[PDB]
Amino acid sequence: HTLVWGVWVNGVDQGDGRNIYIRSPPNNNPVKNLTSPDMTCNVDNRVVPKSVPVNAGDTLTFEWYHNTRDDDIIASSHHGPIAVYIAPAASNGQGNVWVKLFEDAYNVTNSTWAVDRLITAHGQHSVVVPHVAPGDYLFRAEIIALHEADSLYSQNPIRGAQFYISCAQITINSSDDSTPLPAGVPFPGAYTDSTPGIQFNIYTTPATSYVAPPPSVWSGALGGSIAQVGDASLE
Ligand SMILES: [Cu+2]
Known part of the structure; x- marks a missing residue:
């Protein structure tokens, strides 16, 4: 159970984004139904009044929280991967x-899941803004908690992989467009009951055998990190 509070650009806090530049849902409950319209941008997908300006090559950091800013971030039970998509x-x-x-x-080097490292990073993970066409984009940050993922939601709706999905409105101003954005995958649609990494038993299956759901990372992507970029307590 986690939500995005806001973003940082090159280590500069853009301020509380909830219902402002983040398409915030009404609460921190997960999406679990893989065919739900809620898989796109969570349960309250609508245009919010601000878009955060960035340039290609900037470091864009998402900051998550549980109940209040810079708290426990997400229950430590919620082991799983983190992904960021753009549209x-x-x-x-x-x-x-x-x-x-x-x-x-x-x-495998650290023996830690991405969610474990996200807690250590006070809720912060980053991407390099890619060299796509200038204009308005949605950045979809997705945490998958796998502590109840031994079942499919479609077999037992109390269990299943848990998706914590947050869509930020980002405007890319300066970009040479050296990597034009291609067509991508649909949400809902990309993840099905047979997709690798959706049904996984963390109690019985070693995490060294886990394969995250496709698609693969785009060849235009410039990288990222799970690491604290900014100290929310200095504000
Ligand atoms: Cu939870």
């Missing part, structure tokens, strides 16, 4: 539009 804003997230910029699942 042009005119799509409203509909159709074959979502391109994956970032994936982090289980780190």
Whole structure:
């Protein structure tokens, strides 16, 4: 149970974004139904009044929280991967539009899931803004909690993979468009009951065997991190 509070651009806090530049849902409950319209941008997908200006190559950091800013972030039970996708804003997230910029699942070097590292990072994970066409975009940050993912939601609706999905409105101003955005995958649609990484038993299956759901990270993606970029307590 987690939500995005706001974003930072090159380590500069853009301020509380909830219902302002984040398409915030009414609460921190997960989406679990893979065919739900809620898979696009969570349960309250609508245009919010602000879009955060960035340039290609900027570091864009998403900041998550549980109940209040810079708290426990997410229950430590909620092990799983983190992904970030981008789509042009005119799509409203509909159709074959979502391109994956970032994936982090289980780190064999560190023996830690991405969610474990997100807690250590006070809720902060980042991407490099790609060199796509200037204009308005949606950045869809997705945490998958796998603590009840041994079942499919479609077999037992009390269980299943939990999707914490947050869509930020970002305007890319300066960009040479050296990597034009291609067509992508649809949400809902990309993840099905047979997709690798959706049904996974963390109690019985070693995390070293986990394969995150496709699609693969786009060849235009410039990377990212799970790391604290800004100190919310200094405000
Ligand atoms: Cu939860």
